[PDB]
Design a protein around this nucleic acid. Sequence first.
RNA 1: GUGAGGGGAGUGAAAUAGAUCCUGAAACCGCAUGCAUACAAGCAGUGGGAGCACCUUCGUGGUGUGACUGCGUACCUUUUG
RNA 2: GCUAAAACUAUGUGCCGAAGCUGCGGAUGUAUACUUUGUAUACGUGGUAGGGGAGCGUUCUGUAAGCCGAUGAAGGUGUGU
RNA 3: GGGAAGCCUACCUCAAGAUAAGAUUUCCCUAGGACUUUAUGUCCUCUAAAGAGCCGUUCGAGACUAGGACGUUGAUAGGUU
Lengths: 109, 142, 117, 54, 103
Amino acid sequence: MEVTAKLRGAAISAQKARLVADLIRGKSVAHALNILNFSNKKAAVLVKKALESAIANAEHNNSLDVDDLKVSTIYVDEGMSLKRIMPRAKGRADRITKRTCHITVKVGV
Amino acid sequence: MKTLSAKPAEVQHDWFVVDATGKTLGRLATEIARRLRGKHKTSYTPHVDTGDYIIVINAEQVQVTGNKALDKKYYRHTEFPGGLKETNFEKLVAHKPEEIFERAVKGMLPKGPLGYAMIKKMKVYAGSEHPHAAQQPQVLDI
Amino acid sequence: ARVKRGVVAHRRHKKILARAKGYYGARSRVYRVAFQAVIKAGQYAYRDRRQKKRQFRALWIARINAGARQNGLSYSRMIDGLKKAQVIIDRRVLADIAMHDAVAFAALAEKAKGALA
Amino acid sequence: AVQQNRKSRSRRDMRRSHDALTENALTVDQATGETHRRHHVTKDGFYRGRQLFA
Amino acid sequence: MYAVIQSGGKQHRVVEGETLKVELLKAESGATITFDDVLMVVNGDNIQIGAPVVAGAKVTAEVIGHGRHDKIRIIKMRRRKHYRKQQGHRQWFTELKITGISG
RNA sequence: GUGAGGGGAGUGAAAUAGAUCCUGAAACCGCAUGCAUACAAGCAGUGGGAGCACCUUCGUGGUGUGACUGCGUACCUUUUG
RNA sequence: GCUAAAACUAUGUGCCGAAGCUGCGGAUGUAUACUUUGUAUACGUGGUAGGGGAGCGUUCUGUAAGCCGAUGAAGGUGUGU
RNA sequence: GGGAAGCCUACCUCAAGAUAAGAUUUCCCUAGGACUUUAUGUCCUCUAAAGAGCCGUUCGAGACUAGGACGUUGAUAGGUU
Ligand SMILES: NCCC[C@H](N)CC(=O)NCCC[C@H](N)CC(=O)NCCC[C@H](N)CC(=O)N[C@@H]1[C@H](O)[C@@H](OC(N)=O)[C@@H](CO)O[C@H]1NC1=N[C@@H]2C(=O)NC[C@@H](O)[C@H]2N1
């Protein structure tokens, strides 16, 4: 029985967030929290928010113990993109894609 | 599916020892290649190694006919510009006799992973002794 | 009477992609590449249904040659001897017996060389 | 200069096979008991006994 | 004990109780077929090789039924020449169970 | 973070009908399991074929994978080609 | 790799070798005779530009105030045939 | 037998991914149960060696790396004299 939290619409690319997700996949929650607390990556903040939300859900909605939990499942999906126009030299224009992502964290005994 | 292929786990490799004293190089190499590939067994299968182990002794006593001892050339290329190296049979048989047999049999075996595996079953020695007494090779007069 | 193409076109593309299962990369995902890959597979199969008979006959001949040389004959001489002895067993059965029954193959070779003599 | 053929997803992932992150060196501070970065002052201002902020 | 029989333009090496598929025959399902043109009979050390055939030998089999093999696609295509045609095929067979072999 | 977002609760026939919300395909991008893969050269398949995993009417069976091997230089157009 | 050849000349006996020919099974076109037949026999069935013949599926109108459908239509996604 | 600035050696550097993966010296690890898939077998408990790395002070070594030295039993860097 895994407990899920989802953070949707995080303003960061999935490719960047997956690097942080792979770092904590499969570890105990205390170890993962230490790693996220001392990381310098921007995606670490978002992943830590999702993990803490999942732990709180497991504690309050399902009455599980903190000490036995681990990151049993985590993956990052691509969200909706924002489209913008960047003017280049000599009257040429390029299209800019501002990417977002969805983070799913599951904790299980 | 009435015609059966040989199974690698059921193949039996037998050990034979051949003396090269006075034999013609190519006419010995054809028989060695045949027995390494397993063409002499009724369970022969093109994609399975069914051959035997061959130990060649007295490798530097092998002979070539005509004037090939001085005229037959062995080439290699270091891939640097102008890097073509050349030698002949007379020098090579005195220096590295096993390389002559390796070339002669490699040219007659199939070119691929199975051929690479097949040629690993040939052991060539210059002297009259070999270190494989534990495998009890049988004398094979080919 | 306006006709929309979507349902039938989707069905045709899906059938092609289903036949292209297991291929590498775009060959199992992209319709154009997959369609080129299926036709070529059919062409190869048509050619190889003919090649298979030759390959299996070659295998039978090689095994018969090995058995005959174990019994003291060459393949060509053993075939000639069987022909003169009137035996009409084919190469598939001859190779099967050579592989699985050495005594029977020895008897066949003896018959062949007796007819040759 | 630009590619003549689009690169496959397999080759792209093969190039990315060196992109994984690593952990920092963390350690329990014996003076205070909290996890801290090794050789660094803790977030509360402690380092090997001395305390920085009264 | 095994025997060599002719069926459908091809040859088979059979033992008692064997089930095998041959070219389509006109016999009704459940009937018995008798091969009286046996080419070879081997029973242990007893080996009989027919001159064309082994005189006196018989092989009896029972017809189990008839069926069709798996479908084959035939594809022909001449590149750059605007030509292409296809067809399917399923080959009929008759299934036999060997019940008796007598030298 | 009195944010965004989510987990419960509740409404509803239905919430994976939850607000750019009927259905929800493809390109494209993740996670999980099974097998293969770090001594071997090319349109990537095709005809053979060992082993392994799951299932099984226990098999001359089904599903997935595919060591090793014969053959094999995309499609369209325009052209004498 | 090959030298009383695995080279050249002459002779002989075997064998390999194609989608050619034969064997077994199946489809289809034309004609003769069976004086409906759907039947046997004989001869055919590589194809660009082209010519001829026969069909599959899609949307709409009548048949249809019929027939199927919340005990689940269309559409989507698998499996079997 | 003699016979050239030419060939193989000889001189310098690299070199066992030489998958044929070579050699020598020295060092380290000597615990219990259950079960069946009876085997370098699968799960529990116990154990964590010789060494290697992370980190830090750095370099006549350096794009990042890699490589060299040192980490209180200390002169590795800065300062001080
Ligand atoms: N278990 C999980 C539990 C988690 C926890 N609980 C947390 C949680 O739960 N958080 C909830 C967050 C949800 C979300 N953030 C909140 C949100 O979105 N509020 C939206 C608030 C304002 C909203 N935009 C206004 C709106 O709807 N205007 C539309 C709009 O003008 C137009 O519509 C379209 N399409 O053009 C029009 C056409 O009809 O209709 C109007 N509307 C109508 N309504 C009427 C109707 O029904 N009949 C009659 C007529 O009056 C109808 N018109």
